[PDB]
Amino acid sequence: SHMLRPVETPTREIKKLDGLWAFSLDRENCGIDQRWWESALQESRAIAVPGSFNDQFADADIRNYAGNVWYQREVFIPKGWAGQRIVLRFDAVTHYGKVWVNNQEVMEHQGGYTPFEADVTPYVIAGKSVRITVCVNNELNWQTIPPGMVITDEKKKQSYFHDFFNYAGIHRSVMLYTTPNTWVDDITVVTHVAQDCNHASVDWQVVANGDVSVELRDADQQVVATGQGTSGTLQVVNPHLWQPGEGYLYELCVTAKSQTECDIYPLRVGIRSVAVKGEQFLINHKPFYFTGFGRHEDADLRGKGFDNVLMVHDHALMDWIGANSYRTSHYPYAEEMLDWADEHGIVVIDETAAVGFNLSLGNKPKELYSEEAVNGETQQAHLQAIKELIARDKNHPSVVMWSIANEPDTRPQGAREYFAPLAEATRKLDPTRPITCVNVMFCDAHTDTISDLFDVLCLNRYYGWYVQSGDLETAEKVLEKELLAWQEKLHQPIIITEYGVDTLAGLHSMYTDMWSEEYQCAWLDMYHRVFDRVSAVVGEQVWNFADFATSQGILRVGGNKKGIFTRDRKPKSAAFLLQKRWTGMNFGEKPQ
Amino acid sequence: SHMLRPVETPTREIKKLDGLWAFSLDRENCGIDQRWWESALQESRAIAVPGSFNDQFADADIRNYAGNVWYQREVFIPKGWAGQRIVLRFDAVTHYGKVWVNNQEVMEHQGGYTPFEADVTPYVIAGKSVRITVCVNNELNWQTIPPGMVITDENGKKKQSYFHDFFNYAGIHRSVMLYTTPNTWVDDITVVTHVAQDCNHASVDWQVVANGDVSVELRDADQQVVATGQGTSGTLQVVNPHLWQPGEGYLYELCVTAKSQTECDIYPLRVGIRSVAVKGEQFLINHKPFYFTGFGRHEDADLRGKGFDNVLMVHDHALMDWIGANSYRTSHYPYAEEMLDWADEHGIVVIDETAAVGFNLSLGIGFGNKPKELYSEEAVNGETQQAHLQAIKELIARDKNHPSVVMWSIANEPDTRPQGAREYFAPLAEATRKLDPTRPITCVNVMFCDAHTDTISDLFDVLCLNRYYGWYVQSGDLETAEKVLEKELLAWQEKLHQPIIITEYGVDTLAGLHSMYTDMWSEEYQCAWLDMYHRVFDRVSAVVGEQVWNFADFATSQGILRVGGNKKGIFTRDRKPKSAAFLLQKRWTGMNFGEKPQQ
């Protein structure tokens, strides 16, 4: 469970395994039987790690593959790591990985978007080359997060219920890292902030197999507070709060000392509180207004693979357009993104991979919550996905809210019985952040059965698109009516976590009609006018930052075209509309 | 009602009223009450006739208008027309027109796609200017061909609901004209061209309606008299006739003279000597099997909507000729007759279709709440069936003598699952055969009314299937699509043992979208998917034709399925070729003319 982000210290080294690996499909599904991990993969080819495997090859038969694929490389253990605790770590393997070091099985993970690792000290020798084999499986069933159904025809075909392509592979960094045989295994900080903002407290809890001391250092490396033992509270006079748009960070240096060994782990800490009060979202006791995007991890060639240039360029576009926030739609993002948000003061709604709990979007069993679909084991798997997300992200000050799912069908019998325990367990795992369950349009104010269990109303709305098609005048009436009915029903802060229309870049129309750039601008504008008239709306996240790949079908013109930007990051007209609205408002303040 | 195409003759003049007219919306619907026809339209603007009104103005509020609009111009009657029978003719007004000459109501017509006309002799004076007002209505209901529902919102604002996948363009789409005959005139002509098996003799029956003694002269393309006859009816014998053949279209001229004691009238009718017949699973033209290649089309272009235009007709025929197309279907309404004059002259084979699309509440195309029973008093009823019969009569009355027209399609993609379907269609099938016994009939078949489901195709002569396996279902999966397609065509061959024409196969293709994955919306998928259909067609002996959906990208109702319109074109709306145009060019110019390809 304990999952600290590897960082280089006087007591910790890292060796990235990113680069070219050997790669092989297993159409006969005989690689486990033939123990492929005991040899060089036969009939293999070069693949980039990190990256989705699907689009690296310009090959439809690989892109559409369902089953196991195999990655392998050789790596030299640094000579100096003799006597040291050596960990092998995968930041993310989509959706399942099993790992062998030479002929030793070392670890296994279900969940495509959070890290897994094993201590491999006993199975490697410092100064020698070792063989790493990974069996990666991209199949979804009713107990995976997200769910799906594999149909077999004779040949496997993956069915799934979410509007983004089922990219798979080693999407994020692989690495070896070291600790001493005494080490800091875990840290929780809780950051309290007086109402007047003129004092703050920092609770710590540490797990380590040796005596623990902590030093809190400011941005200038001046020690502002010190403590001892596994737990306690640091007092901070006149603290530099972590504020949206700035993101001042302290460093909590955790030392675990044995008589013989010592370990130093620096954790970035942003001093901020988050709370809902009535229909206001407060950060450091001040109302905040969310602007920005639903995103995806999606790009040409690399699929959902992490990439620094893309992270730099996309943050430069969000900065320029005046976005203050985003949501990790619809899975945990690369941790680098949360390190970025921490440092630049970007506000994040951190979401699990639990999209698709919904059989009514655009074969399938009769009852959504039943033994044959979302069941007891599904709910366990969902709890595990929430635990892994919070265990990874609990200390990121940029994360202001947990979204435990996107667009579940809450009409059917058993929805509330499924969600209640998940809402409760989320609050116990992290009491410091509000929780949400992002709401599908047809589960309206008069229909939805679970919104009372959550703190903030995150509504996905597309009136004037899938319904009242091309009619802004009717869409505006229906939208305003529904937001006010939500305000009346629950008196929670409302974030519109999804509003957008498919827009084909370069399609221009004097009739302002669907798919045109001019429609995208008129439709976003109508939404904005309505949001500004409703006092409960504390945010707006446009769907989507950029055009992204989907499953093939008649609704998707080479993918999802709701982007503000093209997949190659070129702006549509609507990017300039958002630039003016979001840079023209006062930072973090509801427009008028 | 008799409908000869106006032609200039020693006895007949024409004056086109095409040009700029005055135009006005009537948002309050007070134009009949205020008798707008009695003066200049009040708040008017210039509009081009012919043309759809919708896209001339770059104005969404006009494009999306439902109700009456008003057209008006002034025109001089030629001085020399004194003593002549003077007719005012509209080749087509979509969907309804009422016409006034000064303050006299002269005409009314329902049906957006065939001509109407009135004798206006008594209401004009030769050498003076008259005012022509037209009230044009674009509303569809359950008794219009095609059908629809007007939804009135809580504020009284009208929005047209309709069940077909093309934009409900309206206006004066085709030429308006005054024309003369003498007071004795040839009012009607039916020819039937019979052709011996050996093709070495032919007979030409004639029947004429006119208020005078009738003689005929049949002249060959060199203007040499090959046969003469007398009386309102009879048979001309033609030795070693130059048959009208697909790819050539040799035409004779049947000159009909009506002579009274005092005056006379000469009408030249172009006649192509050709027989059409179904035998088993073969479509025979001049006793020889024919294989159809080409397109489902639309009347659709930038700015003018469904308006007729000679440059478009010349350019599009040059594209069909280049690509090797030998045929098309008038999807989904009668086309401008100039198209059938072109087909006659160049030997292009045409499936002539009525405007009866939309008889189907279970598609995703078109556009409030649909009625639950398609064939009921509150939807397709007795009055609908009457209106459909009238649409078939008017089409045949116009097109009965075009040798290019080889088959009548009485509708496109009706829902034939309910019991009502056969009850509605059976009498329509029978009446079509009585109206013209010289051509086979069809009713074009929707994909979900499969060989195991459909209830009416036995009543027709040719199986015209509209199929899109690998698109709307088995999306992007050529392998499954191919199995399902082959299985269904063979099940149709077993069931009815008719000739099969695939009258629709196509996939949305965004010009310039390219993919190494050959996936939906790409130029590459369009090519791979048409190729898979071709391979299957060539393995099925009953398939006698292939008409690609569609010749060119065209406008539709706005919705989530349509990326600025229908992108199943082989060409873009501005007539630029997609990669698939070159695929079709190779298959269609590489086969033997009119002959089923081989594996």
Complete DSSP assignment for A416-437: HHHHHHHHHHHHHH-TTS-EEE
Report CB contact under 8 Å: A470, B521: no
| Helical H segments across B249-402, by residue range | 310-323, 337-346, 382-399
From the list B401, B438, B406, the residue with the least C-alpha distance to B190 is B401
* Distance in angstroms (rounded) separating the CA atoms of residues A314 and A318: 6
Number of CB pairs, chain A paired with chain B, less than 8 A apart: 74
Residues 6 or more apart whose Cβ sits within 8 Å of residue B377: none
For A464, which residue in chain B has the nearest alpha carbon?
Answer: B559
| Residue contact B519–A554, C-beta within 8 A | no
Is B248 catalytic? The answer is: no
Q: Give the tokens for residue A123.
A: 């199975």
Cβ–Cβ contact A441 with B under 8 A: no
CA distance B460 to B408: 10
Instruction: Pick B564's closest partner by Cβ from A512, A516, A556.
Output: A516
Q: How far is the alpha carbon of A526 from chain B, nearest alpha carbon, in Å? A: 18
Q: Which two tokens stand for residue A32?
A: 């486990």
- Which residue's entry shows tokens 């298959």? B587
- Give resolution, Å, one decimal: 2.0
Q: Which residues lie below 8 Å from residue B208, measured CB to CB, with a gap of 6+? A: B186, B188, B189, B214, B216, B232, B233, B256, B258
Please state, in angstroms and rounded to a whole number, the distance separating the CA atoms of residues A369 and A413: 7
Which structure tokens are listed for B86?
């003077």
Amino acid at B67: G
Greatest Cα-to-Cα distance within chain A, rounded to the nearest angstrom: 78
Which tokens is A517 given? 């750039």
Mark residue B383 as left, alpha or beta (left: phi above 0; alpha: psi -120 to 50; beta: remaining).
alpha
Of B361, B460, B496, nearest to B417 by C-alpha is B361
Residue closest to B90 by CA, chosen among B74, B107, B76: B107
Chain B nearest C-alpha distance from A142 (Å): 23
Instruction: Say which residues have a Cβ less than 8 Å from residue A126's Cβ, sequence separation at least 6.
Output: A77, A78, A79, A80, A81, A82, A84
Instruction: Please tell me the number of Cα atoms within 13 Å of B358 on its side-chain side.
Output: 30
Annotated binding residue at B59? no
Check if the beta carbon of residue A289 is closer than 8 Å to that of residue A588: yes
Cβ atoms within 10 Å of B67's Cβ, excluding its own: 17
DSSP-assigned letter for residue B91:
S
Who's near A346: CB < 8 A, 6+ residues apart?
A244, A247, A315, A318, A324, A325, A326, A340, A398
The answer to whether B367 faces chain A, any CB pair under 8 Å, is yes
C-beta of residue B579 within 8 angstroms of C-beta of residue B524:
yes
Per-residue CA distances from B33 to A40, A492, B29, B101, B137 (Å):
89, 55, 8, 17, 15
Does the annotation flag A68 for ligand binding?
no
CB A591 within 8 A of CB A580: no
Q: How many residues does chain B have?
A: 599
Extract the tokens encoding A140: 């979804």
Q: Which of B58, B519, B559 sits opposite A469 (nearest CB)?
A: B559
Neighbours of B25 (CB within 10 A): 17
Of the residues A117, A279, A407, A476, only one is catalytic, namely A407
CB-CB neighbours of A311 under 10 Å: 16
**How far apart, in Å, are the Cα atoms of A101 and each of A53, A104, B21?**
22, 5, 84
Nearest CA to B405 among B456, B354, B447, B358? B354
- In A416-455, which positions are buried (b, 16+ CB within 10 angstroms) versus exposed (e)? eebbeebbebbeebbebbbbbbbbbbbbbbeebbbbebbb
Q: Is residue B245 less than 8 Å (CB to CB) from chain A? A: no
* Consecutive H or E run containing A197: none
Distance between CA atoms of residues B450 and B470, nearest Å: 16
CA distances from A468 to A478, B56, B158, B250 (A): 9, 26, 15, 54
Could you give the count of Cα atoms lying within 13 Å of B89 in the half-sphere of its Cβ? 23
Cα B589 from Cα B320, distance rounded (Å):
11
- The question of whether B504 is a catalytic residue gets the answer yes
CA B275, B276, B278: angle at the middle one, nearest 5? 140
Question: How is residue B393 written in tokens?
Answer: 């009569």
**Integer CA distances (angstroms), A46 to A56, A313, A472, in order:** 10, 27, 51
Tokens at B526, concatenated: 């369009």
Tell me which DSSP letter residue B470 carries: T
What experiment produced this structure? X-ray
> Out of B482, B504, B523, B546, which one is annotated catalytic?
B504
Distance between CA atoms of B401 and B193, rounded to whole angstroms?
10
Task: List all residues of chain B from 539 to 578 with a beta carbon under 8 Å from chain A.
Answer: 558-564
Got the DSSP string for B548-582? EE-SB-B----BTTBSSSB---SB-TT-PBPHHHH
The Cα A332–Cα A115 span in angstroms is 10
Spatial separation of the C-alpha atoms in residues B115 and B107, rounded to whole Å: 11
Q: Which ranges of A322-406 would DSSP assign to H, the alpha helix?
A: 335-344, 376-393
Structure tokens at A280: 């206001």
User: What pairs with residue B486 in β-bridges?
Assistant: none
CB contact under 8 A, A557 and B516: no
What is the DSSP code string of A438-469? EBPTTS-TTT-SSGGGSSSEEEE--BTTTBST
Alpha carbon dihedral B279, B285, B289, B291, in 10-degree steps, equals -120
Six token digits for residue A3:
């999952």
Q: Hey, what are A150's tokens?
A: 């594999």
The CA R_g of chain A, rounded to the nearest whole Å, is: 24
Q: How far is B299 from chain A (nearest CA, A)?
A: 21
Which one of A154, A513, A560, A562 makes the best mutation probe of the B interface by having the most chain B beta carbons within 10 Å?
A513
B398 vs A491, B6, B350, B429, CA distance in Å? 68, 11, 14, 19
**Minimum Cα–Cα distance from B508: chain A residue:** A554
Residues of B within 8 A of A558 (CB-CB) are 510, 513, 515, 519-522
Does A95 sit behind a cis peptide bond, omega within 30 degrees of 0 on the bond before it? Answer: yes
Query: What CA–CA distance (Å, rounded) separates A51 from A70?
Result: 14
Main-chain dihedrals φ then ψ at residue B510, nearest 5 degrees: -80, 110
Least CA distance to B561: which residue of chain A? Answer: A555
Tokens 């006062």, located at residue: A586
3-state secondary structure of A27: coil
Q: How far apart are CA A457 and CA A454, in angstroms?
A: 8
CA distances from B113 to A570, B242, B307, B436 (A): 45, 33, 11, 20
Q: Which two tokens stand for residue B508?
A: 């949305």
Alpha-helix runs per DSSP H in B26-79: 60-63
Given the structure tokens 């619809």, which residue do they identify?
Answer: A330
Return phi, psi of residue B421, to 5°: -60, -50
In chain B, the residue whose alpha carbon lies closest to the alpha carbon of A510 is: B58
